[PDB]
Amino acid sequence: SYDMNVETAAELSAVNDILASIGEPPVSTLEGDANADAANARRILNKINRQIQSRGWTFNIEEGITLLPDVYSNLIVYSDDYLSLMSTSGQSIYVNRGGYVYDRTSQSDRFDSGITVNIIRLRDYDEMPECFRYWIVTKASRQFNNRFFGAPEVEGVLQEEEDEARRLCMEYEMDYGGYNMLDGDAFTSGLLTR
Amino acid sequence: RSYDMNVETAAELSAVNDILASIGEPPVSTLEGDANADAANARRILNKINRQIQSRGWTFNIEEGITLLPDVYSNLIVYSDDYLSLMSTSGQSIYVNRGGYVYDRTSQSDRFDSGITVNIIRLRDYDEMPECFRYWIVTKASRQFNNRFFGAPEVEGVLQEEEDEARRLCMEYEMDYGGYNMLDGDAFTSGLLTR
Amino acid sequence: SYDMNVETAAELSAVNDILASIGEPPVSTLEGDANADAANARRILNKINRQIQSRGWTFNIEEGITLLPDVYSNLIVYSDDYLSLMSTSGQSIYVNRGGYVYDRTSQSDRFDSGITVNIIRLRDYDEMPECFRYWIVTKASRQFNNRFFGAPEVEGVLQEEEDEARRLCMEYEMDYGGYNMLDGDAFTSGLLTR
């Protein structure tokens, strides 16, 4: 259940801003001193990054990919990287069992030659658009304010700020998905056929 | 320092860390060596709440008709504490425990051969859970561990808003994952649309 | 009027959680130390288990069983185990008198060859579904919080919590009973005969 044992310059600027949320100064590099101030600020980033991924968003969802079994076992590892696994159409079948995909209708584990699913893959603080990269910080900037320096007046401003941020995030995909009522969907696209 | 450097931890351990971050205090490294109430406190409140989130609802949790098999010699079926809720398939469910064993409350009997067909909610770990719920199992535990122990009203009044937002994301999950249909997939009004 | 002079491991974890409700740390075994903290927590569990049974719920109600008198006496013991005793149809006849069932219409006590009733049998903290096993704890987590460590803020959260627990309990039998308006009842099942 993924570890933060590597470092990145673009991820470093996020940890600075989470430390700004208390009022703490920058940490120059995340190689480490003894401070729980910068250690908790990095974990609350990772703990919230896996929420923002767990939602929603349309670039995050990989429409039908194929997961392939180890031919000799034969099963597919359902890793903690995979945040949410559903099926393509409806009445999704798969769920983990021991860390492995498992049919809850076919009563079976072992199957050959693949599946087609929608995986939300877990990505970094990088591999994210800048709308969300703000909101991953400023949502972390609330729970890091609430767990260590819990001043009610600097949180009550920040709650208004992360809500503003999430709105800009919801502004993003509505454009980015480009979705359509009457011309792009599954049902009422078929009705407009003359 | 290094890259690429892929590595994983216990999801059970990191959940106990987030409970300890929520009350407000430094991360505890390990769980075993049964010292530190805070590691027994946070892990019990995790387990005590994981068995609620399973006790509800959710559709991957419900195993549609499985068979439970008695011994040939006794002949009864053990109804364990692991089985959270046991109902029948259709309606006017018959089964209920009696000494830890399943029991007909209509056939007035305990002993039957050749099995049943039921809906068991099986209890699973903190793992064997999707990530939407793994969040909400923590942040609901982050409230009852805050309430029962760090009894400051302002930290829970924040966190109560947070676990409710978690539950909505959880409620969002199966609505997709079940993919349920009003007029085409159900028991009654699927039959009415037949031409 | 049933005593808690036996012990159970699954019942032990309930007493732990009632002790968590103050903020007190666990008791390992219920064999006993001097503390009234664990002794009052075990009693308030038993005192509330006999309420949740006294309600309602449909697995709890045993539809018509037979109680059988001692052929030589001849009466039926109405024990304190029996929480509520009604008749099958309506205008129920039976009520205790000295600890014994008694007709309040036939003016009599002694009768031969049995009855047919709806007994709510008192069961343990075990022999309960998990929805209720939660709510038997978290209702006990209020009356144990009010009687011994009564901070008003830790009760005010818990009252919201036991209410949410009660709703999950109320959700249970609505499924588990599977009750039907127009196809399963006594009156308007008979109306729909064609």
Author numbering:
A (entry chain Q), C (entry chain S): 3 to 196
B (entry chain R): 2 to 196
What does the study report here?
The portal-tail complex structure is similar to the previously reported recombinant T7 portal-tail complex structure. The portal-tail complex was reconstructed at the same resolution of 3.8 Å, although the core structure was still smeared. Another two independent local reconstructions focused on the portal and tail, respectively, yield the structures of the portal and tail at the same resolution of 3.8 Å, suggesting that the portal interacts firmly with the tail. Twelve copies of adaptor protein gp11 assemble around the bottom of the portal forming a ring-like structure and serving as the base for the assembly of a hexameric tube consisting of six copies of nozzle protein gp12. Six trimers of the tail fiber gp17 N-termini anchoring to the adaptor-portal interface were clearly resolved. This dsDNA density terminates abruptly at the interface between the dodecameric ring of gp11 and hexameric nozzle of gp12. The clip tilts toward the portal axis, which probably triggers the disassociation of the terminase complex, followed by the assembly of the tail proteins. It is noteworthy that If the portal does not move downward and expose its clip domain out of the capsid shell, the tail is not able to assemble on the portal due to steric restriction.
Escherichia coli bacteriophage T7, a member of Podoviridae, has been used as a model for understanding the DNA packaging mechanism common to tailed phages and related dsDNA viruses. The phages package genomic dsDNA into a round procapsid using the portal in complex with an ATP-dependent terminase complex as the motor. Here, we determined structures of the DNA packaging intermediate and mature capsids of T7 using cryo-electron microscopy (cryo-EM) and symmetry-mismatch reconstruction.
